[PDB]
Symmetry: D2
Subunit: 343 residues, 4 copies
Amino acid sequence: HSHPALTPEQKKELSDIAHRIVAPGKGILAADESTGSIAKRLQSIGTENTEENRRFYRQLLLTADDRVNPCIGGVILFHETLYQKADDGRPFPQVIKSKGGVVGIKVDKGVVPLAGTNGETTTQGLDGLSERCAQYKKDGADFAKWRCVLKIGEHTPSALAIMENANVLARYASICQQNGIVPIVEPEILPDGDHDLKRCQYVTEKVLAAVYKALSDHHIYLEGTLLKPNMVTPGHACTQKYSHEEIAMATVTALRRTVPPAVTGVTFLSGGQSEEEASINLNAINKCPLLKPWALTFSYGRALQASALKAWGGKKENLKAAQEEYVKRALANSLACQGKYTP
Amino acid sequence: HSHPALTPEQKKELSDIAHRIVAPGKGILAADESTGSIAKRLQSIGTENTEENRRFYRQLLLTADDRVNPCIGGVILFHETLYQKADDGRPFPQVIKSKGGVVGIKVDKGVVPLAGTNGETTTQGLDGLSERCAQYKKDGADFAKWRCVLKIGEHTPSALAIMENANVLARYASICQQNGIVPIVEPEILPDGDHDLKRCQYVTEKVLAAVYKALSDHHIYLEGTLLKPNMVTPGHACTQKYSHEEIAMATVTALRRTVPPAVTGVTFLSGGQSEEEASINLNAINKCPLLKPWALTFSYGRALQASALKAWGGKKENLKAAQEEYVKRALANSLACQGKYTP
Amino acid sequence: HSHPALTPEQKKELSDIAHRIVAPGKGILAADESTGSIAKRLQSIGTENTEENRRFYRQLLLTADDRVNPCIGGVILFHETLYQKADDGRPFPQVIKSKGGVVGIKVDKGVVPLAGTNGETTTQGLDGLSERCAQYKKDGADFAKWRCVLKIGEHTPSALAIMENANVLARYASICQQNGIVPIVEPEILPDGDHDLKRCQYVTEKVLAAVYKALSDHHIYLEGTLLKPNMVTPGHACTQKYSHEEIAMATVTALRRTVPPAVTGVTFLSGGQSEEEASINLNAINKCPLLKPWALTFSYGRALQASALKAWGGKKENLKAAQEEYVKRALANSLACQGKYTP
Amino acid sequence: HSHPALTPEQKKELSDIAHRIVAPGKGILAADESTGSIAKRLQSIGTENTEENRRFYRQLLLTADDRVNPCIGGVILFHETLYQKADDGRPFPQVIKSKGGVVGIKVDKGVVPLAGTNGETTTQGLDGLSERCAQYKKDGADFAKWRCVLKIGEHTPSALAIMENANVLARYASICQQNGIVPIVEPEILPDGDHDLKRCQYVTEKVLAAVYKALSDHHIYLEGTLLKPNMVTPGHACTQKYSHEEIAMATVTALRRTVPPAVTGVTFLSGGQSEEEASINLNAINKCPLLKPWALTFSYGRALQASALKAWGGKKENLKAAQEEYVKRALANSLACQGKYTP
């Protein structure tokens, strides 16, 4: 019958955390990058990838002034970032809490290939995820991120890939909710190929419907979850051009057809679009005439940090400059989150 | 890939019809009853079941005065009622349109047992449903009704029953949308047994999640559909008592966890509760603090017609009395639909 | 829990019927053809399609001499053929039983389009199928036929098409088994297009796995069922040529990977191949080195009747000639069924 | 479309390994007990659980004389056992190969609870399973074991538990097949509770059908897989008694209704029955009149080692006695595998 996956107290705590993450005007700073993922980001500047370099970069992102506080509602950290400290000895999770944000952790262990598929992948990281999530909860991490990657090809995403990603996302969400951590469901769809806005919307609708069916099957408390979907955008190789209004219409329509309103909020990912483009698209999404029952916030890695890194240059002389770039980009993204971004 | 099940014109027409059915302050009069279904209602008075008696009763329901126009946004008719005429010779569908309502038709052919299940049933009626729906469209019917019946037992509803009912509802919706008729999805759950509010909410969430996953799988245009679910209520044999606020909380919570906002509106069925109880529950649902992205209207068979039938008594002398009874009940249900019903 | 869909007596009767249909050396004569389906067959000669012409053709097929008896274990009849009589006043079902065969009936009501799919179709015929199957059981029909049509395209068959066809086949099987009639599951895959043997095998494996999962979900007694799949063959437009040994290998491999051994037998359909080609393919399948746990028989409409119809010419003078043609073709197909066909 | 999960060489190697494991007269010795799992076994004697004690016990199991060679076709080792050596310095995998057996490894990382279920669990171990399976392949392990635990309760196994266990088994099988390792699919159903033989058969059929549907969905090469299901037996608390012939009938019937013949063989697990009971049940299963298309062998942990461990007593003086006990038990189980076990 009905065996409560979560007690009312656990549901209340998860709802409180999720609503704090996507509180009005607040979004998510996705600062979770592995050693190799941030290696490409640091190599574009010319600065070598070291433990101290990573720590200083994340301190620069996290030690922003008071103007970032009402704009960043949560920060996703990598495993090693959760246990680093700021210059004053203050731990990074405590630095995030002191700014009013919610500490997050990337709990997925990357993608692995799916046999019999056209290069399609499923995400791993469920092994010992209960113990890991409990430890992260004791270490200040109140929500988790699990990046499930799907792409659009002539025969992709397949039924197997969508089902696998939805099932693994639901299992991750169940484990996180059992451990008191809000799971951010990310059925990210790669904007790779010549597929247009219509096919991206169709694929996003199918993927999100399967994801939420899997979440229902796993007894996931949707009020204690957040969604991190790809913006419904044409592929990078698509010749046809779409305005930000059309992209917003497609994204909001795809969300309204699949996502139940119980979801606390939808925190979009940039997904390979520029900082200004991501902010404008988020603003258009929040300005969409269609009624949007969720908090449509941002969870941006590149769209909040590309200019910050470029201004930083890897040297301490531009600490304040990179901080200012990141801060004003967070201001713009918060304005887009409230629908009041006018570039 | 993405093969459009409906052209943008068909989607626009379905959305227009669905929004007209559940326009603010308007609900649905479920006047659909087979010969045997209305036989029990007519036998409760002592009036014999004839073609003329059925015609006069449905004329009484349909030819109400002007105050019932802004309260009834749609009327579900039986097959024979769609082809009957009022006393002035004006056909019943045209009677409905002349009052601003939307003509509906019961297209399901009843429930049939599912083998290997504990008395569970699936609904038939898909044979020639395309031709039937096209004919109904030419005859004025703009939306269709398909009653899928589920119950709650110690091992019920099973995976087979939920899956089969969701699949048949999705097929019915696909056929209706292809024929230009708005499908009202009714995954009705019987309030039979001693199950409490919590288990009814759990079963409703599971059934609705499966139903909307099936609708997604069948490429159903959810903006051109309406939902007719059971109010989340304890079973008739349940000893524990629940307030109307608790029932509204459970119902709205179950809807928000499974129903996507793209659904034009949710038209509740009475499901064996009294007229006053149904109206109070609808009012409490529309007064629920949780944000409700859909038009929460009524689709009441007995909750709109029981008092009218008793007042009528089967004789022509109480025509005006039964008209006034039905009209005031529809006014109350419309007030509940807007959340302004104060008995 | 486990609610028996069938009593042990029902299971015993279904197993007895199914084993009688596919008894060693015996196959199925698929004489089931609607008025329009047989219209093209009769128009290839120039003979007008009348009730008497259809009756005489089916009598010619059914009134064969004693040499057809050990080769035809079952005959599928159309609805009107089940209620026609031979020249001597003997009803056609009784004519079939007098020859040791098992009377079958086409219970599906044709295919209907699936919305949102690339020309994919699902089969209807479930409305009142319980009453129809009971009546057929009283009229001598001991097994039923349900043709589900799938094709192979660049994006076809889709998940929706495979799932819906499997579900409708499982519902048909449940109804037939409840009514004491052995359901012949036919997830026929069209050999249309340029797809090769490998892709036909892949699609057949996927379709059959989904079909048998649906049969399990519907509590279908597989020992009281038969399978009527397409031979795994390259498409009609495929340029690459495959030997009969390769086709047999692919077909037997696809059956062994999906079909559980509980299935009484697999009765292949010709599916657009010539009579000699179908017989040679069946012989090669029964000569396949891989162990085959089921009775691999034939269920041929065109491959058993093409030459008989051509020799008949629509006139009574060639009655004996067409009878001999059909009889020798049945002998060849029985030899292929036992693996002893040497043309 | 059809993307080959495995090349024909990979399929040939997997089929060769699987057929070597379940070659006629040969079964599987399951020595895949973790430190805590074998702790209870060693505490039944009073011998402390040490690295040396575990090594000597597994050497005693593995270094048996020549007469045990044609009875054990494969040995499943724990992770630490795969890297231990015999007394003569010969590694345990090489000891297994020298006896004609196939080295196996337990790759699952135990069961974890499923939220919202009645104490139901899912199995973890997919993280880095590709690299682990590749390393095991380089270390001599040619097949892998993944124990998925299911139980029978008043509402258990649920749809979520069956679906998730089948999906994780399919993912494990895909990874193992990609790494050249034959996956032994074990959807073990606990014989706990008062459920009878009929309900165990029903649950086993449902679980196996879901498992093989998941294997089909994940493009698993079933010829390169083996099945390790529970013998269909009544629960431990069941009052009704069933004969060995009845248990064999139920088990073979459940296997024939769900397991496709492409599976190389079915290696039963003891599942809490005595050694003699397991051998008699295996003999009755292989003596079942129903045609069995697979090699019905044994994969016994307790049924092959319980009396051998008891005779060992934890001291070196009973090395020969315990080896003789294990050898004669393996001879009995091989005789049961060929159906020639007469106690």
